[PDB]
Amino acid sequence: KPLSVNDELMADTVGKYEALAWLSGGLGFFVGLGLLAVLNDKASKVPFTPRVYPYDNLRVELGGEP
Amino acid sequence: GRKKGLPEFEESAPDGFDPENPYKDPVAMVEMREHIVREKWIQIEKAKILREKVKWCYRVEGVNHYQKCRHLVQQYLDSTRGVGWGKDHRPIS
Amino acid sequence: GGGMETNKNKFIEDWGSARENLEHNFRWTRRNFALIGIFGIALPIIVYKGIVKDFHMQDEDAGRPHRKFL
Amino acid sequence: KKMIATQEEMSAAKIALGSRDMCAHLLIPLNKCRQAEFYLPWKCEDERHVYEKCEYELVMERMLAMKKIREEEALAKQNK
Amino acid sequence: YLAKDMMIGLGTNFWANSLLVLPKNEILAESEFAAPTIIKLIPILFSTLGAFVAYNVNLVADQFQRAFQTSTFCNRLYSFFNKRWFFDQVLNDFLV
Amino acid sequence: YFNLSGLILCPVLGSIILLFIPNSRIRLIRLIGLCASLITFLYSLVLWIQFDSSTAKFQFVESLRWLPYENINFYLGIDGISLFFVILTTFLIPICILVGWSGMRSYGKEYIIAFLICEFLMIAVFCMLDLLLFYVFFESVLIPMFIIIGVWGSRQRKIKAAYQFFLYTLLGSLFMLLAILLILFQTGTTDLQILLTTEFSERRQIFLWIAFFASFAVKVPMVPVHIWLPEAHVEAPTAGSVILAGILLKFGTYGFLRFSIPMFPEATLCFTPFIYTLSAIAIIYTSLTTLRQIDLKKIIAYSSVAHMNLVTIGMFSLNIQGIGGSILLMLSHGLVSSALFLCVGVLYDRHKTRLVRYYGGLVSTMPNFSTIFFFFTLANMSLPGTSSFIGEFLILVGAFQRNSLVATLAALGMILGAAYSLWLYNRVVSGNLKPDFLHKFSDLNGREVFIFIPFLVGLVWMGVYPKVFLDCMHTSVSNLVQHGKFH
Amino acid sequence: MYLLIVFLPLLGSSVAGFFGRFLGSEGSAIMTTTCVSFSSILSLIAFYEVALGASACYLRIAPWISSEMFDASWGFLFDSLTVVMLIVVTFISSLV
Amino acid sequence: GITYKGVTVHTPKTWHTVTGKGLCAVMWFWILYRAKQDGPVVMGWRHPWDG
Amino acid sequence: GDFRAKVWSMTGGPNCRPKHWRRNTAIAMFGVFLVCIPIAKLSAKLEQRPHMPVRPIPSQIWCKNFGTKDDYEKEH
Amino acid sequence: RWATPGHEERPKGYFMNRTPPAPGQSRKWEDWELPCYITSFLTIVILGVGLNAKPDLSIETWAHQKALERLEMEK
Ligand SMILES: CCCCCCCCCCCCCCCCCC(=O)O[C@@H](COC(=O)CCCCCCCCCCCCCCC)COP(=O)(O)OCC[N+](C)(C)C
Ligand SMILES: CCCCCCCCCCCCCCCCCCCC(=O)O[C@H](COC(=O)CCCCCCCCCCCCCC)COP(=O)(O)OCCN
């Protein structure tokens, strides 16, 4: 029983390509949900104006020019 | 038998060296190389001292470090442009 | 059995000898030619082009003209 | 509502940036008493409630303005 | 409960300079009173729904697992979630 | 007053004394050889103490006339670059002597004599400041190493490996010698300090640089010529491999640092992408080929090519982080790699085999060896707190500043380096025992425990406080970074 | 007192792994448990002192890597964020 | 230890049962006590003092 | 087994239980205590507190670098 | 478990796999131990007493006290 030449590296119900297709579908679920989130456009539906800080949006306290 | 204390180096450009034809007087060339290395190390240590100043300004001030350490941060970043053998920004010494 | 030396096996020893005597095992087939002409002739060229172009783009960002790397 | 907390007193209390908003004057005593009570969640209630009410007032005052601006946007488009 | 006030309170100085949040992207105040009370109760409703589903599938059920023995898609769907979304199998074969 | 003359004469006296001693007195030969090696090591350590670290001038300079008109002469001197190489090459010899302590009765006096002549020849290589004599001692190492490989080889393959190594070294050597001759004829002399102040015409820089690269790249195997190293390394005694990997692989990089990076500053810049390309693929290819090797000594021998090709990325970066951090890697590699071959030598001396298949479960029978083997496995895979990480990280920060892409490719070296380094340890040490193959064991003896001690101490001392070594080099490596530059 | 927080587990490991043959299966457990527990109580004082007392401590032992400007010394930084992780990590480690 | 059909079940010691019951009772009492204090707040029926 | 009783390991081996582990355990504590003293003394010397504490903290008993770096403009 | 004396009177296996010498005798040293131990002692003595006593000559010290001097002369 001579040993194999590649005798140094040695989910049975699925194949590599079929399981890759399943993984691609699973990740396409995330991609489609992201596209739906883009389509929702939640940015234009914000219920409050952007917060405005005093002293010119705290320019001096944030490192701005004195 | 070297004298006790820190090393002493003459801080002056070696006379006889001309940038027009550097490969003219070999001794002035090596002296100039050593001298230039010495001032580049001086610049490096000055940048390190400024870095220490910024380091202890960030910790002592705290939240107010944006307005109190602005003066030091810009000095340190101005002094780190011409450090030496670093990024492609090389000083014209 | 008063010896520390291994009881070497014929199968393992022959397999190791075959794996170490692979120098004389080419047939110069299309697989070897394509393999050595791609992963030994093209990947180095691709990498060299990568570093050369990285240097070129570093040079152009600072405004200095390109350096003659030849 | 006009600012009461000036710049030098906010820096002395070391109020975190972003919390130096319109209601910062009420935040200084609240932060003083939080430290003196080890940040316990049941000791400083009178100070906390005033600051929370001020913050709620700011949030309501901004949402009302945003509602007005959206009403103005919706009025112009459909009345073209 | 003890650390709720010091860490996620409004304007707390517990963190001091450890954490920096820029004034522009600060939405902690609106997180409390800017949203309908339904949003603050979604996790509880979903937790109750999940608990009810788990009880109805485990403690008392007809055990319709015969679907897993007659539906080819159900068996493959069961294998997909069980085998870590087919990461170990696919990643091994295609990279390692 | 300790100078370079006594350090070089000590191995001479050691080899002469054993030359005229009867072979029946086996004890006296071993004692005198070990004493000579230890005295040389202490001499080097003393030379470290009195080393000035504020001047770029060569220190402890000594001169001896060679040609009648003083055109070429024996100029010996050390600087911040070659001091640690001298210390390492004097420290490795006593370990090599101690390796063959038990079986020395069969080798005889010709073993210690060969190793002492080796030490004599390698000390002068790192100390020569003359281009021609650096070549003379550069290629004088072949004879002792040829004898070591052939006379005391393992199997009959020793004839082939010695021939192959000798042929490669010769073909590099003469193509370098032609360039050395052309430099001598044009300039007039071969003194390094004079050759560093002579302007070379731009056309002659490329040819001379290529000719120098031909000889150096063989001894720092880049890509086309790393086929002699595995065979000659495996067909070598346990102490023979320590010399080949510990020091003989450091000639190419030292030759680049001393005679290439300075004498041609313009040529070095033009060929920088070429060296980056060869080193990047060598790191990727060799660290990947290592996974599919089955010989214990052929896996570690492939761990040196990846590490030594990571050094040539550091040297050609031409900054303090790069050049300065590349020196620490070679000192670290000279200790980590040479310690790994001691671990393999321990396994081979007891069980006369090297295939990884026969080894397994040694954690339950040789625990001290497993603890020591694991520690050097961590060092080989660039763990922080070890001397390898300091050199490995300093090279990366020295190359990222010059080219982000080459620092990215070289960063995958530690990805693959950590793969086979631990995977080998799992096979050899961890697992179940195989009583069918091998059943008698013996853990490390007194010699093996004591031999590994300086490696253990010298690996963390450089790994947690490398400031001792670094501060002795910055004055010397900074003058190396800029030579043609004047701004 | 702050170096003890970091180095007590190291000393316990260095004792229980180098001289475990003299302590056995009980002494080796006692050494590590006692060292980690003392580190945990020291982390409790560190929390009372830095997080609640609002006085961070900065401790530098020696320079580790000193290139031209690649300075990464052996420095320890205890601020509000660090102390929370201390009282979590060390307490969980002592309980484990 | 009670045997029904060969198999026996060792009765747990008093310390374990008492501790488990006490901890569970403490959890329930704490949940109800918290629901008494700020239960209306999370329901949105009443702000603490905001309005 | 029978051969693992003939193997010397630093950790002690399988099911190690020396006859005098009580005495050895007491010595190990005392050794750890003796090496922890210089570490504590070293820590109290190299530690820096730029900010005065809100309330008297125990570290003021031994540490002396409280409010020292307030003049950061003259740092090295 | 925590009170019963142990059974292993002495640690299993000899240290460095060397049998203890004859009673009332001593481990006879090998021919290499004494030179190696005196070498290892002299190495520690030279490095600890030499590196810590050599003057702090460096380019990160002279340059430091030159930069610290020119940094204040600019004011
Ligand atoms: C270098 C920087 C990072 C340092 C990380 C250190 C992490 C530990 C590294 C070594 C761990 C040992 C792994 C290799 C040996 C595998 C296990 C072994 O055989 O070791 C022996 C020896 O025991 C040890 O593991 C000692 C090594 C670890 C203890 C020393 C560590 C000291 C602290 C770590 C270093 C301090 C500084 C770290 C920070 C830089 C234990 O044998 P037993 O448990 O009794 O079972 C074996 C069966 N039979 C007895 C039959 C043989
Ligand atoms: C029984 C062992 C079992 C296994 C043990 C595992 C390892 C445990 C021991 C770890 C190694 C400890 C080494 C010390 C590392 C931390 C201290 C760094 C050394 C240090 O800071 O001092 C510098 C050198 O002095 C010195 O102290 C130098 C003395 C060091 C002697 C080391 C001898 C190693 C021999 C290696 C020979 C080969 C060398 C490599 C070629 C001087 O500091 P400074 O420069 O700032 O001066 C300032 C003057 N104002």
Query: In the sheet where G75-78 sits, what is the strand order?
Result: G75-78, G57-60, I47-48
Specify the residue with its C-alpha closest to ligand 1, atom 51: F364
Pocket mutation for ligand 2, best pick of F461, F467, F470 (most atoms within 8 Å of C-beta): F461
Which helix (H) or strand (E) is G20 found in, with range? Answer: helix G20-46
Q: Nearest CA of chain H to the CA of D6: how many Å?
A: 25
Cβ separation D11–B62 shorter than 8 A: no
Nearest to B43 by CA among B6, B91, B9, B7: B91
CB-ligand 2 contact for J61 (6 Å cutoff): no
The CA distance from C7 to F396, in Å, is 46
Count Cβ atoms within 10 A of the Cβ of residue E29 and give its class: 0-12 exposed, 13-18 middle, 19 or more buried.
buried
The CA distance from A17 to A23, in Å, is 10
What does the DSSP 8-state code read for residue F472?
A: T
Count Cβ atoms within 10 A of the Cβ of residue F381 and give its class: 0-12 exposed, 13-18 middle, 19 or more buried.
buried
Sign of CA dihedral I45, I47, I50, I52: negative
Pair I11, G21: CB distance under 8 Å:
yes
The CA distance from G86 to G47, in Å, is 8
The CA distance from F63 to F75, in Å, is 5
Pair F165, F241: CB distance under 8 Å:
no
- 3-state DSSP call for residue F365? coil
One-letter amino acid of H34 = R
Strand G57-60 with G75-78, pairing:
antiparallel
> Which one of A46, A59, A60, A61 would you mutate to disrupt binding with D, by most D Cβ within 10 Å of its Cβ?
A61
**How many contacts does B have with F, using Cβ atoms within 8 A?**
46
Nearest to F186 by CA among F122, F246, F131: F131
Cβ separation I8–J8 shorter than 8 A: no
Phi, psi of G78 (to 5 degrees): -110, 105
The CA I72 to ligand 1 mean position distance, Å, reads 45
What are the angstrom distances between the C-alpha of C6 and each of F340, F349, F364, F434? 21, 11, 18, 11
Instruction: Report F:334-373 residues touching I (Cβ under 8 A).
Output: 364-365, 367-368, 371
- C-chain residues near B88 (CB < 8 A): 58-59, 62
Q: For E19, which residue in chain G has the nearest alpha carbon?
A: G81
Contacts with F317 (C-beta within 8 Å, 6 or more apart), sequence order: F323, F395, F398, F399, F401, F402
* Token digits of residue A62: 């944030």
One-letter amino acid of E33 = F
Question: Which residue in the block uniquely carries the two structure tokens 């996790």?
Answer: E43
CB-ligand 1 contact for F384 (6 Å cutoff): no
- G-chain residues near B86 (CB < 8 A): 68-69
Can you give the resolution of this entry in Å? 3.4
Query: Which ligand is located closest to the Cα atom of residue F431?
Result: 1
One-letter amino acid of F352 = K
Helix, strand, coil shares of chain H, percent, nearest 5, are 60, 10, 35
Q: How was this structure determined?
A: cryo-EM
Pair F360, F436: CB distance under 8 Å:
no
Three-point CA angle F43, F46, F48, nearest 5°: 115
* Token digits of residue F331: 């000192």
Q: Is J60 an 8 Å CB contact of chain G?
A: yes
Number of the ligand 1 atom closest to the C-alpha atom of F370: 15
> Which one of I4, I7, I8, I11 would you mutate to disrupt binding with G, by most G Cβ within 10 Å of its Cβ?
I11
DSSP string, I48-71: EB-S--SS--GGGTT---BS-TT-
Rounded to an integer, what is the distance from CA F243 to the centroid of its chain?
Answer: 7
Contacts of D among chains (3+ CB pairs under 8 A): A, B, E, G, H
Contacts with F305 (C-beta within 8 Å, 6 or more apart), sequence order: F221, F226, F229, F282, F286
Cβ separation D66–A53 shorter than 8 A: no
Cβ separation C19–A5 shorter than 8 A: yes
The CA distance from I48 to I66, in Å, is 7
- 3-state DSSP call for residue F76? strand
- E-chain residues near G56 (CB < 8 A): 16
The CA distance from A38 to F349, in Å, is 68
Q: Nearest CA of chain I to the CA of B38: how many Å?
A: 20
What does the DSSP 8-state code read for residue F78?
A: E
One-letter amino acid of A59 = R
What does the DSSP 8-state code read for residue F245?
A: I
Task: List the alpha helices (DSSP H) in F20-141.
Answer: 26-49, 83-99, 104-107, 109-127, 131-138
CB-ligand 1 contact for F48 (6 Å cutoff): no
* Token digits of residue F234: 């495996």
DSSP string, F162-200: HHHHHHHHHHHHHHHHHHHHHHHHHHS--BHHHHTTSPP
Q: What residues of E are in the A interface, CB distance below 8 Å?
A: 22-24, 26, 30, 34, 76, 79-80, 83, 85-90, 93-94
Q: Nearest CA of chain A to the CA of D39: how many Å?
A: 26
**Candidates J1, J2, J11; nearest CB to G21:** J11
Cβ separation D21–A60 shorter than 8 A: no
The CA F430 to ligand 1 mean position distance, Å, reads 13
CB-ligand 1 contact for I16 (6 Å cutoff): no
Contacts with F66 (C-beta within 8 Å, 6 or more apart), sequence order: F72, F73, F74, F133
Number of the ligand 1 atom closest to the C-alpha atom of I11: 23
Which helix (H) or strand (E) is F75 found in, with range? Answer: strand F73-78
DSSP string, E8-59: HSTT--SSTTSS---STT--HHHHHSSS-TTGGGHHHHHHHHHHHHHHHHHT
Phi-psi group of A23: left, alpha or beta (phi > 0 → left; psi -120 to 50 → alpha; rest → beta): alpha
Q: Is F215 an 8 Å CB contact of chain G?
A: no
What are the angstrom distances between the C-alpha of D20 and each of A54, B61, D16, D28, E14? 9, 16, 7, 10, 15
